[PDB]
Structure 1
Amino acid sequence: EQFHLPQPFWPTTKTKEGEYVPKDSIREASKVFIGSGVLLGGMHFRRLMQYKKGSARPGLAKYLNLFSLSKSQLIGFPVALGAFSFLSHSFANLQEGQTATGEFAASSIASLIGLSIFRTKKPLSSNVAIAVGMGSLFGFLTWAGNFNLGDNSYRAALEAGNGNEGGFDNKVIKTERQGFWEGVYRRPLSQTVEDLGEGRGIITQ
């Protein structure tokens, strides 16, 4: 008998057992690592030409210095992004889906791998704190449902008839659990026992 704990999790579309064709972690991660390296490397060489186009104009130099990346950054960034793509896909396959826990782990580990490259002249604990901060942000991103709930939103549920447009009726009791956005007047007592359990006032005193 597991403990009865609250579940503050937004609705997500679930795939039944046998679904969720796994993602090729190596191929997906290699595309990000190669693509990032070419663009970051390509722009670095292009910015070098801008320096040679003119070096006696302070205005141009000021903006070029901001966009300039160090050699470690030019190496660290593709590796961190490549590691992020691999771990995010690898952890998703293990759980048969993408979760905030896996994204927190994928983001924090990949950031720490990258931080150890271009942030060498810093304490290790300093890089761990940033890696935890970076991983928590992307874990929050997945928990919130990425940029949009999509078909799990109330507007999508309202169009599908899973909303509360028809009102409520206490004389109709549904054995199955209601929708995420659906409200009811009266619920089965068995569902309350499932959510809370017997004990402190449910059924028994």
Structure 2
Amino acid sequence: FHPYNTLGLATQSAMVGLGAGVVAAAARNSLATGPRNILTTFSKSGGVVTIFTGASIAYVFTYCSAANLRERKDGWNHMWAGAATGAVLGARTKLVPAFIGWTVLCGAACGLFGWTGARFNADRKASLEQSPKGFVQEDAHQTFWEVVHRRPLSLTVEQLGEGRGINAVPIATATEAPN
């Protein structure tokens, strides 16, 4: 893998969240009911700026940190980032069990989002349609979407491990009397 620059990405994160919070505050000011002016965009906004900035900083910082600590790029980093973002969103409600639930559940949700590829889109060169499918032809290495009538036994033993029934030689041939 290639390391992430935490502080730079998180500074970009904070500026983006700040701009988004300003836009949401302006939208709230214009959509609202009561008497309002150019003063109220930050007085009467329900912590929108702090929501956006905190979520952005927390998510990007935690993601890049976990990617640099774990030394990997996978969906567990999105699980941690969701845990942190949920902790921020749940510290607003000044209650412990709601904070814990927010953390755990948005961690699980963003971790699912990362497990599935960290994308609302598709890869479109890893999809089943664009990838080699069906039965594999002549002793070739079975790819992900390919099908096989009969698999290699060394592969089974490595993927699964010896023990609990699964052995490098069948039992009957391995116990056959040398006659």
TM-score by length of 1: 0.65
Cα deviation, residue 181, structure 1? 0.8
Query: Is the alpha carbon distance of 1:127 and 1:186 closer, same or farther for their aligned partners in structure 2, counting shifts above 3 Å?
Result: same
State, as a whole percentage, how many aligned pairs show the same letter: 26
DSSP 3-state at the match of 1:199: coil
Look up the match of 2:59: 84
Larger mean Cα displacement after TM superposition, 188-197 or 101-110: 188-197
* Cα distance in 2 between the residues matched to 1:47 and 1:153: 41
- Aligned partner of 1:104 in structure 2 is 79
Could you tell me whether the CA contact under 8 Å between 1:29 and 1:86 is conserved in 2? yes
User: Contact 1:173 / 1:187 at 8 angstroms: preserved in 2?
Assistant: no
Distance 1:204 1:119, change over 3 A: same
RCO (CA 8 Å, sep 6+): is it higher in 1 or 2? 1
Deviation at 1:134, TM superposition (A): 0.9
1:1-205 to structure 2, matched below 5 A, reads 20-45=1-26, 47-48=28-29, 55=35, 69-70=45-46, 72-116=47-91, 118-120=92-94, 123-145=95-117, 146-147=119-120, 148-158=122-132, 163-164=133-134, 167-169=135-137, 172-174=138-140, 177-202=141-166, 203-204=170-171
Aligned Cα root-mean-square deviation (Å): 2.9
Provide, for residues 50-96 of structure 1, a one-character-per-residue CA deviation record: whole Å limited to 9, x for no partner. Answer: 769x84xxxxxxxxxxxx731x4432331122111111122223334
Q: TM-score, normalised by structure 2?
A: 0.73
- Residues 121-148 of structure 1, C-alpha deviations (whole Å, 9 max, x = no match): xx21111112211111110111112222
Instruction: Could you tell me which runs of 5 or more consecutive residues in structure 2 were left unpaired when the two chains were aligned.
Output: 36-43, 173-179
Instruction: Please list every run of 5 or more consecutive structure 1 residues that lacks an aligned counterpart in the other structure.
Output: 1-19, 56-67
For residues 102 and 130 of structure 1, the distance between their equivalents in structure 2, rounded to whole angstroms, comes to 17
Q: Distance in 1 between matches of 2:32 and 2:159?
A: 66
